[PDB]
Amino acid sequence: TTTILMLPWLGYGHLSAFLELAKSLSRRNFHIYFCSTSVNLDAIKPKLPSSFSDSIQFVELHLPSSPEFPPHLHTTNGLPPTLMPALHQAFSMAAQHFESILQTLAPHLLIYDSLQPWAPRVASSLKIPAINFNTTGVFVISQGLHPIHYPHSKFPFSEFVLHNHWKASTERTRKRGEAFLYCLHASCSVILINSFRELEGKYMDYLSVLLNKKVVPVGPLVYEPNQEDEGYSSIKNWLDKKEPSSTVFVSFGSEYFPSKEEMEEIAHGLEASEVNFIWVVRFPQEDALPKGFLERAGERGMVVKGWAPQAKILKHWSTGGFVSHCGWNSVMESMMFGVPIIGVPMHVDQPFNAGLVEEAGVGVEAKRDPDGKIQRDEVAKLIKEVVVEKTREDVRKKAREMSEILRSKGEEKFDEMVAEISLLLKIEHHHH
Amino acid sequence: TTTILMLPWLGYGHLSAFLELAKSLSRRNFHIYFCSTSVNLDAIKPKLPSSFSDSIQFVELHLPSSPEFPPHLHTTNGLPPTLMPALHQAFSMAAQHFESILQTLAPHLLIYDSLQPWAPRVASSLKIPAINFNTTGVFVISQGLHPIHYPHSKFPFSEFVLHNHWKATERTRKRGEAFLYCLHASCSVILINSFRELEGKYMDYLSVLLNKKVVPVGPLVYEPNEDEGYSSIKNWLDKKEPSSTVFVSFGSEYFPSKEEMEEIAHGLEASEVNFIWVVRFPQGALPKGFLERAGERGMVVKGWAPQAKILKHWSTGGFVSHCGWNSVMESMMFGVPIIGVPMHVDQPFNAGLVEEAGVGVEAKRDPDGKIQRDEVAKLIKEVVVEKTREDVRKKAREMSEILRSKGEEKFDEMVAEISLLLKIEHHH
Ligand SMILES: O=c1ccn([C@@H]2O[C@H](COP(=O)(O)OP(=O)(O)O)[C@@H](O)[C@H]2O)c(=O)[nH]1
Ligand SMILES: O=c1ccn([C@@H]2O[C@H](COP(=O)(O)OP(=O)(O)O)[C@@H](O)[C@H]2O)c(=O)[nH]1
Structure with a gap:
């Protein structure tokens, strides 16, 4: 009333x-x-x-x-x-x-x-x-x-x-x-x-x-997802095959279209890491990827076109990392579900969000070079440390503690x- | 209104x-x-x-x-x-x-x-x-x-x-x-x-x-925020290794018999687990050398304990419980596997529920209906001290995730x- x-x-x-x-x-x-x-x-x-x-x-x-x-x-x-x-x-x-x-x-x-x-x-x-x-x-x-x-x-x-x-x-x-x-x-x-x-x-x-x-x-x-497939059933079968905590979700949000140069660095860093990845690539309402990259990746990588069930993928036990633009909701979702963030901020509040994740210890930020460019080597090293080799157990421990706090509310x-x-x-x- | x-x-x-x-x-x-x-x-x-x-x-x-x-x-x-x-x-x-x-x-x-x-x-x-x-x-x-x-x-x-x-x-x-x-x-x-x-x-x-x-x-x-009583307990738990301690409680309405207490105590001692046991007496007990032998591994709290806080502590890996409903719900919510020792009323059914769900185990009574020290010791070693019942621990984590997600x-x-x-x- x-x-x-x-x-x-x-x-x-x-x-x-x-x-x-x-x-x-x-x-x-x-x-x-x-x-x-x-x-x-x-x-x-x-x-x-x-x-x-x-x-x-x-x-x-x-x-x-x-x-x-x-x-x-x-x-x-x-x-x-x-x-x-x-x-x-x-x-x-x-x-x-x-x-x-x-x-x-x-x-x-x-x-x-x-x-x-x-x-x-x-x-x-x-x-x-x-x-x-x-x-x-x-x-x-x-x-x-x-x-x-x-x-x-x-x-x-x-x-x-x-x-x-x-x-x-x-x-x-x-x-x-x-x-x-x-x-x-x-x-x-x-x-x-x-x-x-x-x-x-x-x-x-x-x-x-x-x-x-x-x-x-x-x-x-x-938002907590429920049991229509926006592609999850196909993705869930692929994720089920993987090892626990072996895969990164890659998204740059609903409003930003990464440059050809930026996505080249992201793809190369992904390939060098040797990680499993689900990457959602969007086009205004491959041709934007390095040549042979998806073939070289093979079944390690899956590219989802347009939109993906982000929350469902983050909750899957095979997911061990979130390569994200660090938009607030994605940051909040990753923290709720205990997935460490590998930050690749693009614009607006995202660099500040990436810094916040970094001081909290729940995730890491891939630093840009002095000319403001994404670095494939930084992308590869953080995925290797956080996800592939798990030499950053401090970050994983903080992310889980943060998730437990958020779940407790x-x-x-x-x-x-x-x-x-x-x-x-x-x-x-x-x-x- | x-x-x-x-x-x-x-x-x-x-x-x-x-x-x-x-x-x-x-x-x-x-x-x-x-x-x-x-x-x-x-x-x-x-x-x-x-x-x-x-x-x-x-x-x-x-x-x-x-x-x-x-x-x-x-x-x-x-x-x-x-x-x-x-x-x-x-x-x-x-x-x-x-x-x-x-x-x-x-x-x-x-x-x-x-x-x-x-x-x-x-x-x-x-x-x-x-x-x-x-x-x-x-x-x-x-x-x-x-x-x-x-x-x-x-x-x-x-x-x-x-x-x-x-x-x-x-x-x-x-x-x-x-x-x-x-x-x-x-x-x-x-x-x-x-x-x-x-x-x-x-x-x-x-x-x-x-x-x-x-x-x-x-x-x-009930998700928690004595108040100072936890302070002594938390310090003791902080010295323990992760998932190394069992909390032991039989609830607010039942006082185990002297024989029942001794079977529980011997089961704990043989297992070699770390334990926090709440022992209480009616408004208005243990084997002779039990606490001395247990030493740092064992702590007894008298009257009442902060059950929820202890259960959420990372050092806690098991809950030996009488399987009262709220205690069972709390254990599932916080992801602590139950080692069930039901006493009376609805508790046997709750213990059976826990076992079939796979989040915990039930200590079986002997044919004459008595607690068995050997069974108590076995389950704690399998679930807590030597984590060989990994199916149980996995199911408990999944259940807590289900409950926390609600x-x-x-x-x-x-x-x-x-x-x-x-x-x-x-x-x-
Ligand atoms: O493929 C996608 C991309 C995004 N999202 C959701 O869209 C929202 C994006 O909001 P955010 O603040 O993270 O970034 P923005 O798009 O505003 O830059 C989040 O809830 C994501 O989970 C999604 O479900 N699938
Ligand atoms: O030392 C104790 C014993 C019990 N409880 C709480 O009291 C309730 C026990 O209720 P339950 O249904 O499990 O058993 P009952 O006492 O009814 O037999 C739960 O909230 C326990 O966490 C507690 O806080 N401290």
Whole structure:
């Protein structure tokens, strides 16, 4: 009877994190209007069981469309990188439809993602409380805000150094302005963040000071797969043949297409390691591999095209490593399932995520050269040490300990969020 | 706000399972009146975080008391077996106070344990829906109800055979309960503290046996955060090698005989395993040189121990248990193989369940029904000291992984059933 409209950013990782939060809120008696573009809603629907049909309603947000930019392309998932400016521009023009949705549905609360300036603002003009759910980690945000207040001083609690490659406009201009966003309401005085104290507790305390905001951990939000084959049955038979802890899963996410040069280094490092591997290779919605590489690999390697059951593969006992771009959800999934990460970060928050994995001791990062390039030798050495020869038992011990901590978490994970939301509603009700 | 009054039986294990269910219900916006005797309410209160103070309220049930049978004895936890007659009798006399509580609180729903026949009768008189929560396993009940309808036919899905020792007032009441009638939505469904991976077939059979919907809510395992008592135990365990130590406990309601204790002690000593043994005495023992010989390998804790914390310690590789249900659930959740030494009541069935599942082993009693030191020593060496029963250790890890993987969906079926029955019975 208390309704919440949830608005993820367009992007599969954001959609997944919001959906898991939606399920918890639905179980706690909130009615959820889960709002996204049709293609994203369709992509995420397999993960919502029929049990939620009454409580979580999928609500379509309409973006401007054209015959060459139809609604199927209204997502970052597999989007050609050049079409990305159109996606932000079309999303920029979806505010009027969003306003119509809010006026009609009249939700008691809005939970919104961090790439929609208009979303809280539209909610505000209709006197609807709104709260920010940040689907990614704490470490990156605190590192972003720390220079503002301390241009000369050292970042506390970490020895991480950003590589010069990442250290080196319209979105950047937008992000900087967002650092100085004001708050005169209860709803904007707290944020929900998809992390947990055993990994980021010090950073969460620091972030709250930097923001003057309550920081509520609600994570990690890891989707647990069930018993349609998206190729698992074929893959499960292949994995069953392998030795325990002998295989690496290779993925670079739902939004990034590695360069021909980058994938050459990844493939050569994979071949030199002599590891088993399942590599998901994607093309905008082999010809990108070194010649003879898949033949030289033979049955040691399997390439899955387009999409793979990532969570299921990570849970298989043959999997001993995750060569990953270190997108937050993949990092959270690997930690939940106890698979050590061999980090190959690409852009955005991923280098920060790789550093976090490295200090925690659960995984390792393949360092780039001074010119910012992937190194096949570094890729080969880490897979040999972590997976093939298992000379990094410290990393494997830390990963298992971390998994046990994460598995140990129960429904208390959401208690602080529930208490804050109830306060939010009671306060804003009086001031309308 | 929908209000539920929960009435566990007076055993600590029943209190623990009810409290975990109460937390699940509280998080789903039900107000909980948690009702039991003062001694029991005080006993479990440390496991209830302060955040639940608003949503879970402890409501005292008064049993008749005398100077020699004071309220601190109104529990089966540590009770002298010679006072069980008095405990059951006083419990029966508390029915009038229960009615006064229900009349005042007027809960929307009563969740009652399967040991209090007056509780559903008081509830029916006050027009309060009441649903049965069974804290223990499915297997024992289906095993109890199968001969009624199928004499001359063996139990359909198990190769378990009860030992003669166990085949050799309460039973009279229990037998009548098998035929109790249901004419209401509240009695048409029962919540049980189990999970289909271990008892799925038995649940389906029990549903037919009872003509009732069986809703699994388990396993309900308390995950821990004396408080300083662990500090001494943790230091000792930290010196041990990984998976080198057995925890030994026989529960809150049974005191093994001197002969039983000696067989267990000699089995431990011969095995040469590291061990933590909780030895307790009734409210208000070992071979002569046992501890001296054991030395650093052996530690005895008196009265009560932090079972869950010890079981999660990496040094712990085995649990010698009496096989009470909650202890079995905890061992499976934490991946510790059970070395079963069942004593009485439902424990033999639970031990048989553990063995067939493959997560643990059962120490067999001799033809006269006695504990055998040789059997105890053999199993511990096979499972803990010399890990030759790797099939058992593998199955235990798999089971813990299954249990740890379970999430909030565990309670969806219960919540739907409660919603339905309340709406149905409201109309009448
Ligand atoms: O072949 C694939 C690729 C990705 N994923 C899932 O898609 C999400 C990716 O989110 P993440 O934050 O890891 O990275 P992003 O795509 O946002 O860069 C994760 O849940 C992955 O498990 C998947 O199931 N199969
Ligand atoms: O020294 C002890 C003995 C028991 N327990 C707890 O008490 C419960 C035992 O319940 P069970 O159903 O296994 O046996 P019962 O006492 O009912 O026979 C479990 O939570 C144990 O972890 C404990 O904490 N410390």
